[PDB]
Structures are given as structure tokens and as C-alpha cells.
Homo-oligomer: 66 residues x 6
């Protein structure tokens, strides 16, 4: 399986350790819910600049300014 996680950096996060927590976490979910083969699980975390992420028609940067 392939899992793509796209998020916006926040408070110096996520750290390398946190990305690892996500990688292992997401992979374990697939195994627990679908009994998938963890060995073949690929995960990619994309960090999007607050200015390149939009929700509701506004950027995350513009939203955090509130």
C-alpha cells in the first residue's frame, strides 16, 4: 500500500522523530485494520508551506493570523 500525508509545519514540528511516529503509526494501522503486509507499506510525508495550503478558500497562513 501507499500512504501520502500532506501537512503544514507547526511550532518547529513535525520533528524527524514525529515523522517516524507517523510512518510507523500509519503502517501499523494498515496491518491492524486490513492485515496488510507492513514490509511493503510506503509512506511519504509532504510538508506544505502555510502559504501553499488552502482550506475553505483561504490559506493556512491567513487563517493562523487570526
Amino acid at each position: 500500500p501507499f500512504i501520502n500525508i500532506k501537512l503544514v509545519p507547526e511550532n518547529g514540528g513535525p520533528t524527524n522523530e514525529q515523522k517516524q511516529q507517523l510512518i510507523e503509526g500509519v503502517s501499523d494501522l494498515m496491518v491492524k485494520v486490513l492485515n496488510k503486509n507492513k514490509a511493503s507499506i510506503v509512506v511519504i510525508i509532504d510538508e506544505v508551506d502555510s502559504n501553499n495550503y488552502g482550506l475553505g478558500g483561504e490559506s493556512v497562513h491567513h487563517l493562523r493570523q487570526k
Copy 2:
């Protein structure tokens, strides 16, 4: 955040219930690991034919048989 899960169906699954468990599990994981706002977490699960998914150069179809 946005999470895209791509997987190959098998054994009549994943059922709609298993899909619900994946959405919940990924969303809770984000909230738990990075204190994300579950309300904004979007998840999309794509199901790929076994003849369309390759690993190591072989199709999942040939790998399962």
C-alpha cells in the same frame, strides 16, 4: 491535513466498515501525534486493481498468485 491511502482490494475487502476504521485511525493518529485539528483532516482511499499496482517490478496480481 490531507491523507491519501492507495491500496489493492482483496478478499471482498476493504469493507465500508474497514474503510471507516482507516479514516478514523489516520485522523486520530494525526490528532495524537501532532495535535492536528481532526475537523480539518481529509482522507481519501483509492482502490487500485491488482494488475495496476506494482512492487519490485511485478504486479500485485502475479505476486498473489
Copy 3:
């Protein structure tokens, strides 16, 4: 440029005409905001089953 639009179908939407509207709408947006090469714009619309799309931890089907 490349634009990927993922949505969950509903009420018989989107029809093939509405998909074309999205393709034209997005393509004209890039040329108007960035003056990008209209002829190099690639758009792909993906229709996601209500049970496969989640928002707030719940599937669109549930919502």
C-alpha cells in the same frame, strides 16, 4: 502546470459537461493568475466513492 481535483459524486453530479466546466474553469484560472501556457495545462478529476472519502474522521457516506 498540473491540477488534480478529487471529489465525491452526488445528485448525479458531476456530469460530463460539468467535468468540462471544471477543466475550463481551472485552466482559465492559471492563465489569468499566472499567465501560464494554457496548452500545457493538465487537469485530472477523480471521483471518490462516498465511503472512501473522509472529513473530520467520518466518511462522506456517514455525513
Copy 4:
């Protein structure tokens, strides 16, 4: 709805303001065509290096020289 836009930066663009126009425009198009929940609209803009984007078998870094 989710919209991913991948482009190659050019002449200083897109600026944070132009990115907002893309996020706004995209979100308005989804509402005008299918009346989707505007608040649930997620938009991600990825800027690709001109040496990492190909078209017609050639990189954008080269095509811009023609």
C-alpha cells in the same frame, strides 16, 4: 473536495498573494459548479523546480530557453 496544483515558479511568481488567488479561485469554482461545501475545500500548491518537471520529454528549464 481536494485540489492539488503543481507548477514551476517563474519570474518571481506565484507570490503569496497569487497563491491566495489560486486558493480562492479554485474554491469558488467548486461552489459555482457543484455547490460543494466551501469550508471543506482543501487546496495544496506544489512548486516544482524547472529541472524536475518534464513536458514532451524535455525539462521546463530548457524549454524556457527557446
Copy 5:
């Protein structure tokens, strides 16, 4: 590495055999260029409806009479 190929079906293609060819093709390409590990190469082929694919602001279905 992960490779995603999105295309529009036509005249019955791509066949399961042609999909296999794309998987082996892309996979071998990675090994030859960056000597990447074959076993870790994941390939996903998405087949996009001609009414769902647009180029130059025209759907592939309309761009084919």
C-alpha cells in the same frame, strides 16, 4: 521510490500485459539511472476516464472527436 502513472484508456489499452510492461519499464529505468533498489519500487497506474482528463482546457473525450 514511488512512481504514479495516470493515463486515459483507448482501443482496449492498456492491457494487463501492457500494464506489466509499464511496471517493469519504469522499475528498470530507476535501477539503470540511480541504481535504486528494485524491491522497493512501487508503481501505480491510474486509468482516467477521457471525460475526466483535460489538456489545454479541453477534455480528452472532446479532443478526440
Copy 6:
């Protein structure tokens, strides 16, 4: 068509030359197998940090510790 390639950089690579080889390689592959139109082929190569890519539940940074 559209081809997205996601890989993790390593040992001074991939260079622009190698990225160009990937663009041409994938493009030729599409032309050879499905006679797809070259001009319409879009390829985007993404370079993922070794800490952002996982396989088997371990980041690539970790996997690369072992030869």
C-alpha cells in the same frame, strides 16, 4: 499522460542530467508501449527527504544506516 516520480536523494544525486534521463526515459516508455503523444506527456519528479519517506514502517534515513 502524467507521471509523478517520488524518490529520496542520495550521494550527490539525482543530478539535473539524471532527472533529465528520467523525464526522457519515462516519456519514451509511454510512446513505446501505448504510442501516447510525446508532447502531451507531463512528468514531475519530487525529491523527498530521507526522514519524510518510509518503507516497512521505518524512515529511509533509518534504513540507510544499514548497508
